Design a protein around this ligand. Structure first.
Ligand SMILES: COC(=O)c1cc(Oc2c(O)ccc3cc(-c4ccc(OC(F)F)c(OCC5=CC5)c4)oc23)c[nH]1
Ligand SMILES: [Mg+2]
Ligand SMILES: [Zn+2]
Length: 324
């Protein structure tokens, strides 16, 4: 097995890594081994004096606090967002733009960004007067909680992978991570896309032709949108991966609707197993959310993302062709 796993980890720099095979081959530890691989690949253990055993201990505890009984928002999803972010960090239009602290902030943010997700939406948790929504006053309920858990687990035994950062490093990292995770709230998609379009309209390059980011506001905005794109990258992946991500999100929404049934609440969109239209939902999802976002990202990093935009469009075509 470990030879086969090691073989698959050779694709970690590739869009469309078989994240599901890696989950099998690593014994349901995709998040731990893809993070480990990426930290070695970016030489982050030595840059930040992260002890290897501390890194593994933390990664396994983090992976544990993703719910294995949740169909979509589990550790496989987290592994895939970490790995997609890692590919997007390497894009040529971003070369040498981001410090190693920002690279670590982004990768860390991706890893924790959905931890302890209960498999239901913010709105469901607001609507059922959950403790989470009560704790967080109905605003970015899950995303605040993923942050709260991601950081808290650093305090478990031999889990503080940031123990050797400077105090100023930790401070900057923490703020960047919060700023990134809070931006994965889907209720902020339109605004984040709006601001990203504005950045593309006013884009500035360097003498190297690489993107020019003067200040925290612009730099965190690019990392926010990057991890957001990675979060919304399932329909840009090879169709065999895309389809399995759809099967998983559909099952999670369907389970939520059932909970909405046993409560007399109305069923949210796309959550009713007796009134589903999965293909048309994917096409609408691509047309109104996913393709607008990625087209904008593609203009930002043009032409670095063309093959990704290609696959999205092919996949969009294909989901259309299966519509009755
Ligand atoms: C609050 O904002 C929304 O409700 C909005 C976002 C989105 O719902 C989501 C969230 O609120 C928060 C996180 C997520 C992730 C996905 C998602 C992921 C993959 C999908 O299909 C494929 F890519 F695998 C997917 O399909 C969307 C759909 C059926 C209509 C949704 O949808 C999410 C649809 N409506
Ligand atoms: Mg989320
Ligand atoms: Zn996510």
């Amino acid at each position: 097995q470990e030879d086969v796993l090691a073989k698959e980890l050779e694709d970690v720099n590739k869009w469309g890594l078989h994240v599901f095979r890696i989950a099998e081959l690593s014994g349901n530890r995709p998040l731990t081994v893809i993070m480990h691989t990426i930290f070695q690949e970016r030489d982050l253990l030595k840059t930040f004096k992260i002890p290897v055993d501390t890194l593994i201990t933390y990664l396994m505890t983090l992976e544990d606090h993703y719910h294995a009984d949740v169909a979509y928002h589990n550790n496989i999803h987290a592994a895939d967002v970490v790995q997609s972010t890692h590919v997007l960090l390497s894009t040529p239009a971003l070369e040498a733009v981001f410090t190693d602290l920002e690279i670590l902030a982004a990768i860390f943010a991706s890893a924790i960004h959905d931890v302890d997700h209960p498999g239901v939406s913010n709105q469901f948790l607001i609507n059922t007067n959950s403790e989470l929504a009560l704790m967080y006053n109905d605003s970015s309920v899950l995303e605040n909680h993923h942050l709260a858990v991601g950081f808290k687990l650093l305090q478990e035994e031999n889990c503080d992978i940031f123990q050797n950062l400077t105090k100023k490093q930790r401070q900057s990292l923490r703020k960047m991570v919060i700023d990134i995770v809070l931006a994965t709230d889907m209720s902020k998609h339109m605004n984040l896309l709006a601001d990203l379009k504005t950045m593309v309209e006013t884009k500035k390059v360097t003498s190297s032709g690489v993107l020019l980011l003067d200040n925290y506001s612009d730099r965190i905005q690019v990392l926010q949108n990057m991890v957001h794109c990675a979060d919304l990258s399932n329909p840009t992946k090879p169709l065999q991966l895309y389809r399995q991500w759809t099967d998983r999100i559909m099952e999670e929404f369907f389970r939520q609707g059932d909970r909405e049934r046993e409560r007399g609440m109305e069923i949210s969109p796309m959550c009713d197993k007796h009134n589903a239209s999965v293909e048309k939902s994917q096409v609408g999802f691509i047309d109104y959310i996913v393709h607008p976002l990625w087209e904008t990202w593609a203009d930002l990093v043009h032409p670095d993302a063309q093959d990704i935009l290609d696959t999205l469009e092919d996949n969009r075509e294909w989901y259309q062709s299966t519509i009755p």
